[PDB]
């Protein structure tokens, strides 16, 4: 439960930075998938409309790539 | 502090989805910036290497766009 958007990140960061490199630092990064977010997903945008960017869409667009948590390209960076 | 990457998201989502649409639902979304993440930032990738994708890089690549928190394109979607 984040109090704000910018403040959310502060909390977010500590939480994510540790979570994703946890998988990479552990052994490897997908690298290909993250490009995918920075590529474009019909979700991250459809997200704009569905709540903080409908996580299933945006952070999922991101998780499916850089936010990192793509069970499809992982086996490395989750 | 997230226990895992996938589990992180569960927590994340509730936290973000509320934070970003908080700004949009409030009045408007940048829309242009979010495309920016789904576009490509030298950060989100440089992030892959600097911790869960160095928030200042990835979620900042995302915040500077879809994760949402771009004080540059905001005035709407933070």
Domains of chain A, CATH where assigned: 1-78 (1.10.1740.120)
Q: What sections of chain B are H helices per DSSP?
A: 5-26, 32-37, 42-49, 58-63
CA–CA gap between residue A7 and residue A15 (Å, rounded) = 13
Instruction: For residue B17, give the chain A residue with the closest CA.
Output: A52
The token duo for B12 is 């994340």
Test mutation, A7, A17, A33, chain B, max B CBs within 10 A: A17
CA angle B18, B23, B25 (to 5 degrees): 80
- B72: how many CB neighbours lie within 10 A of its CB? 10
Test mutation, A38, A46, A60, A70, chain B, max B CBs within 10 A: A38
Comparing C-alpha atoms, which of B71, B10, B35, B6 is closest to residue A1? B10
CA–CA gap between residue A58 and residue A49 (Å, rounded) = 10
Backbone angle region of A51, left / alpha / beta, with phi > 0 → left and psi within -120 to 50 → alpha = left
Residues of B in contact with A2 (CB under 8 A): 15-16, 18-19
A33 touches chain B (CB under 8 A): no
Q: Tokens 């495309």: give the residue.
A: B35
Maximum pairwise Cα distance, chain A: 36
Compute CA B71 distance to the chain's CA centroid, rounded to the nearest angstrom: 12
The DSSP code for A13 is: H
Residues of A in contact with B77 (CB under 8 A): 48
Torsion of CA A68, A74, A77, B1, to 10 degrees: 50
Instruction: For residue A4, give the chain B residue with the closest CA.
Output: B19
The token duo for A11 is 């909390």
- A45: how many CB neighbours lie within 10 A of its CB? 21
Experimental method, per PDB record: NMR
């Amino acid at each position: 439960d984040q109090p704000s958007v910018g403040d959310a990140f502060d909390k977010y960061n500590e939480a994510v930075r540790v979570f994703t490199q946890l998988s990479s630092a552990a052994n490897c990064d997908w690298a290909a998938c993250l490009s995918s977010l920075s590529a474009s997903s019909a979700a991250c945008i459809a997200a704009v409309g569905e709540l903080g960017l409908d996580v299933p869409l945006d952070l999922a667009c991101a998780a499916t790539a850089t936010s990192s948590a793509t069970e499809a390209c992982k086996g490395c960076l989750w």
